[PDB]
Symmetry: D7
Amino acid sequence: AERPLDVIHRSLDKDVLVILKKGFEFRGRLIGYDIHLNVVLADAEMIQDGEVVKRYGKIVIRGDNVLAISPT
Amino acid sequence: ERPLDVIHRSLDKDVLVILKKGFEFRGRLIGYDIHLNVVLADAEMIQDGEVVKRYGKIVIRGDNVLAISPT
Amino acid sequence: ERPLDVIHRSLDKDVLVILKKGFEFRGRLIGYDIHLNVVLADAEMIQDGEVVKRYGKIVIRGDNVLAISPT
Amino acid sequence: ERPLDVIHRSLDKDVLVILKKGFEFRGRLIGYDIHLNVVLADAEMIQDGEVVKRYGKIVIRGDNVLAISPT
Amino acid sequence: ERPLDVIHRSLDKDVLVILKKGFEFRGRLIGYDIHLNVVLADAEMIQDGEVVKRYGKIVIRGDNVLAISPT
Amino acid sequence: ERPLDVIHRSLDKDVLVILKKGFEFRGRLIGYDIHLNVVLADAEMIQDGEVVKRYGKIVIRGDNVLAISPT
Amino acid sequence: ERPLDVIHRSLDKDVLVILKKGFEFRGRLIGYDIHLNVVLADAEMIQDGEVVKRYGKIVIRGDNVLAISPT
Amino acid sequence: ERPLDVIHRSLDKDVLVILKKGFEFRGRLIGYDIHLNVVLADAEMIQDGEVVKRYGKIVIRGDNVLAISPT
Amino acid sequence: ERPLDVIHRSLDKDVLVILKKGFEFRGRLIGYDIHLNVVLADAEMIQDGEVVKRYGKIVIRGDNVLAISPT
Amino acid sequence: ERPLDVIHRSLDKDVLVILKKGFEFRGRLIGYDIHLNVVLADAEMIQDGEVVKRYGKIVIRGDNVLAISPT
Amino acid sequence: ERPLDVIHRSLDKDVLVILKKGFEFRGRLIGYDIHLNVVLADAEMIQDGEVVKRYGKIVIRGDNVLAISPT
Amino acid sequence: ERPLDVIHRSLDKDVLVILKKGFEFRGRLIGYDIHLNVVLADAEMIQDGEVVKRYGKIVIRGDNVLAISPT
Amino acid sequence: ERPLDVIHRSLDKDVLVILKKGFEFRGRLIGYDIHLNVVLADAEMIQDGEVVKRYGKIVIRGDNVLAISPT
Amino acid sequence: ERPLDVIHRSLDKDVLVILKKGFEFRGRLIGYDIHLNVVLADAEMIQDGEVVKRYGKIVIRGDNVLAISPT
RNA sequence: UUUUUU
RNA sequence: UUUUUU
RNA sequence: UUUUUU
RNA sequence: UUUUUU
RNA sequence: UUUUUU
RNA sequence: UUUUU
RNA sequence: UUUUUU
Ligand SMILES: [Ca+2]
Ligand SMILES: [Ca+2]
Ligand SMILES: [Ca+2]
Ligand SMILES: [Ca+2]
Ligand SMILES: [Ca+2]
Ligand SMILES: [Ca+2]
Ligand SMILES: [Ca+2]
């Protein structure tokens, strides 16, 4: 029953939340990932203290910076 | 009782995910892997006994995990 | 007297897990793995000489371990 | 869609390499590798939205990367 | 004399283990492995030139080691 | 222009090694390896745009590299 | 003039080990290995420019080295 | 339709296992692995067109397989 | 020009599979993997210019393969 | 039912071990490993259909196996 | 000089591929890999000094190769 | 009772090594390794029930082994 | 002196390459690798004591090698 | 006494190398490696009990080895 | 990409 | 589970 | 593709 | 290329 | 080289 | 041992 | 699938 890469695979093309280790989190459409847990987000927004401080049409995030990922 | 025995048996049960970052997550274990990445459902980010956040389902990268305790 | 010999023979006995962070755990070792992850039963988190929390059972990622001592 | 499909397609294109340590780099991606090391030509270090330095060509260890955004 | 030749010849000898953090353990080396995890007997934690603790036996995870010096 | 292509073409040329800590070394690239460890001759440790130290030859462990750039 | 060539080359010669945490080690190189672990003889630890400690022999874990320099 | 895609789709179906030796087995594929080992049910060993034997269940070492055909 | 380039650019095309045993199969290449296992559709086992057998779909373990030739 | 599921479920049951060399062994599977090496108790070497030898306990190198059959 | 140096320098040149079994292939080398798999264009299967077959292009699996000689 | 368990328990005991070749050895097991290489003392080569040779101590290459049987 | 030590030292010297197939090659060793593949210049395919063939340069897949002797 | 322990102990000594091809070499062991490749000086090829050839020094691919016995 | 499908 | 024992 | 150049 | 020197 | 000694 | 253990 | 693209 239901593992890391299953939820993530199934979350393809759906909106997710990427909480990083640093302190901030990104939000956007999950369009891809890899075994390292690297993820590609479309129409992403960099959220900080609850405020969208930056946006990117597409962004590739190194999975080692990832604290968690949640589907929205 | 090895780490993966305890974890695997905790499936569908409530567990505590103590992160090294300071805070912890509490929720229902529904999945995991060799890296100790874990999946919780009906999870709550807790900070000082304070539920400061909730998630329907959340995947936690195992290298952030400090420890895991089954409720 | 190798790391895994000592740890292994400590099965079902009381150990002292020192984390690199700051605190430590005290409890009966009931499991472990080649990554040095360890499972403790009747564990008590310790901060500055005082128990601050108790876990019936807890899996600690060996990655946060400084040392382990058979008490 | 996949991490590298994106990076690969960004060759000879402008990108933003967001560093873990705080700042970021902007330049034309002219190279990379499976470790995510990236090569930029005509790049600038960007601290607080401002250019603090320029490099005609610079190699960045993927070790220090947080993200890479095409364009 | 390679790293592990020196360590291997220190079995049952007194050694100094200088940790990364800021302190070190002094004691009799009775074991070790490839990761540089070491096992000391009749050991003592030394914080700023002072024994702040004592362990009859302790397995230190090699990852926390800065240096080992045969005394 | 893969990372190692640029680094290879840099043999016996001057390069700037930007470290993670906060400083940089400037010298002639006369060697390197798969880990991105590099060797520099007639090198200068530079702190704040200032030559704070010098070394006829130095080996910089790749793990401390933020980026290397050909001047 | 690759990293290990220079290091190998320095066997039995005087070197300076720059650790990432600020201090350095001066001594005669007498051994090493692939992880960059180094063995020094007649070594002294240096901080803010002064000798703070001496070791007849010392094995440094390499994972802590920034650079090594012959002489 | 990679090799394992076809084999995966043949689960619970009838296949022909052509062995390097010269004979073959015929049966219902009920399992397999990455080495190409295969498990057949109600299998009949065939030699020059003759059923020479029957096995309600048999595990064949893929090392002995030349080809598998979905019938 | 590389072995796998040719194979990959042969998908959905007719190929000639020469086995080491002595014979050969002809058919349309509908799949393969890095072990050089291959999948043919509408295949014909050939013994001295004669169609001795026919398989609508067959998977061959690359280990039995001597060479593969397009058209 | 994967190759190893079937084998594992046969522990302490009678099985047939068909070797590549033509003959076979019949016995009660009392063990095995991932290489497909298996152990049998009260085994019988068979050839042409007759017991030509008996062994109390025999370990067969998995590399010699053609197929294994339960019952 | 080294196997691949020689094999790499022969690209687009005529080579003789001597197979373990009873024969050889002659043709222009257009591609190869690390398994020593070779790709020949305008190839002729040679046997007992005579040409028995011609292939516009053929991929030879390295483990069937005995030796490769640059014409 | 896994393969390497039976072999380990036969140390300093009499065993029978059936070679895949054609003949077999008989002697006292004094050592082995992961490859199933084995070392025998007072070994006797046996062919067709006849001792054709004797060895004080012989080292046998594992991949030549068909089986091993404790006397 | 070790396998590769001897081989390395025979560079540019005449050697005998005894193949497993039976025949042997004689030539000047100009190169080799860890798989034990070797390159001979001015080579002679020797059979039953007769030079039945010659090659200016030839790469021999070490997989067919039985031995190599320095002349 | 593990396989390689016996082999190592035999250095600079007379041993017998029983090849799987049938014949056997004899000579002084002056080297070897983890593949079981061995080197003999002043070696003799023994075919059916009689010396058929001599070698000042020969390197034998451990792949053809059946066993080795210290004279 | 996780579904045994490398 | 480290005890060669995967 | 081997040339340290993954 | 073996020489710890990847 | 195998000896815990990469 | 295979059962994500 | 090989095309750096895991
Ligand atoms: Ca899958
Ligand atoms: Ca063990
Ligand atoms: Ca290269
Ligand atoms: Ca070397
Ligand atoms: Ca050793
Ligand atoms: Ca399991
Ligand atoms: Ca690709």
